[PDB]
């Protein structure tokens, strides 16, 4: 049948990635996860200095056409070759990774609830919430330890782009969520609840 389509959005470092991955792990082979943060437009032909200036928190930085195409293919029972973005080099990497069709599809990303075309594919819409100061702390650690950023560059990107875009584009999408999940990285009860809903949907698919 139709998969269960779950959209999970939230600000940067809100716990949304960890929650989606945990749900994916709880369901095993019955889930396909498509992270929108790997779908930035391929601007690899542009010099680094130009890629450094792009605002990666504005909707137009994303290859929405491709993301939507992949989600639609998964919905038809077809596999897709998912792009992989290189946060260190600031470009779409040459690597790709296959994603197998499954009865539950999870679309996760800071802006997955922004485009009506994406929201119209979703059966369940989740927004993962956490205060900006706590998210900034996790973002700063993530950037310095995994993405080769300096503390100074993180502060500048955050104040000049991440925060303004979060207030203008990300936070208002919270109004479209069916449920809001706090403590996304460590919330066993909320995880069990999302899992129970998906399991009821899966049981519906096999029963007749």
Ligand X SMILES: Nc1ccn([C@@H]2O[C@H](CO)[C@@H](O)[C@H]2O)c(=O)n1
Close Cβ partners of 180 (under 8 Å, ≥ 6 residues apart)? 126, 127, 128, 129, 174
- The distance from CA 2 to its chain's CA centroid, rounded to whole angstroms, is 21
- Distance of closest approach, residue 192 Cβ to its own copies, in angstroms: 7
Could you give the string, one character per residue 29-68, with x where binding to its own copies holds by CB under 8 A and - elsewhere?
A: ----------------------------------------
Q: Which of 105, 113, 124, 162 binds its own copies (CB under 8 A)?
A: 124
CA dihedral 154, 156, 157, 162 (to 10 degrees): 100
Please name which of 58, 24, 19 lies closest in space to residue 41, comparing C-alpha atoms: 58
Query: From CA 96, how far away is CA 102, in angstroms rounded?
Result: 19
Neighbours of 173 (CB within 10 A): 20
Query: Any contact of residue 121 with its own copies (CB under 8 A)?
Result: no
SS3 letters across 119-137: HCCCCEEEEEECCHHHHHH
Partner that binds at residue 192, options its own copies, ligand X, none, CB closer than 5 to 8 Å by kind: its own copies
* Smallest distance from ligand X to CB 148, Å: 10
- 13 known ligand binder: yes
Considering the rule CB under 6 A, would residue 67 count as an interface residue with ligand X? no
Query: Do 146 and 27 touch, CB atoms closer than 8 A?
Result: no
Contact code string over 72-91 relative to ligand X, x by CB under 6 A = ---------------x--x-
CB of 37 to its own copies, least distance (A): 24
Q: Which residues are annotated as a binding site for ATP?
A: 10-17
Q: Which residues bind its own copies (CB under 8 A)?
A: 123-125, 129, 174-175, 177-182, 187, 189-190, 192-194, 196-197, 199-200
């Amino acid at each position: 049948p139709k998969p269960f389509v779950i959209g999970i959005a939230g600000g940067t470092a809100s716990g949304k990635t960890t929650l989606a991955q945990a749900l994916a792990r709880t369901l095993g082979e019955r889930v396909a996860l498509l992270p929108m943060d790997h779908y930035y437009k391929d601007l690899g032909h542009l010099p680094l200095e130009e890629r450094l200036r792009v605002n990666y928190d504005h909707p137009d930085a994303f290859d929405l056409a491709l993301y939507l195409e992949h989600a639609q293919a998964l919905l038809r029972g077809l596999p897709v070759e998912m792009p992989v973005y290189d946060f260190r080099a600031y470009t779409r990497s040459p690597r790709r990774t296959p994603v197998r069709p499954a009865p539950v599809v999870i679309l996760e990303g800071i802006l997955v609830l922004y485009p009506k075309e994406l929201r119209d594919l979703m059966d369940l819409k989740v927004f993962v919430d956490a205060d900006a100061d706590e998210r900034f702390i996790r973002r700063l650690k993530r950037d310095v330890l995994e993405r080769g950023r300096s503390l100074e560059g993180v502060v500048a990107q955050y104040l000049e782009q991440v925060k303004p875009m979060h207030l203008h584009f990300v936070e208002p999408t919270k109004r479209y969520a069916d449920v809001i999940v706090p403590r996304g990285g460590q919330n066993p009860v909320a995880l069990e609840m999302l899992a129970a809903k998906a399991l009821a949907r899966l049981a519906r698919m096999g029963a007749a």
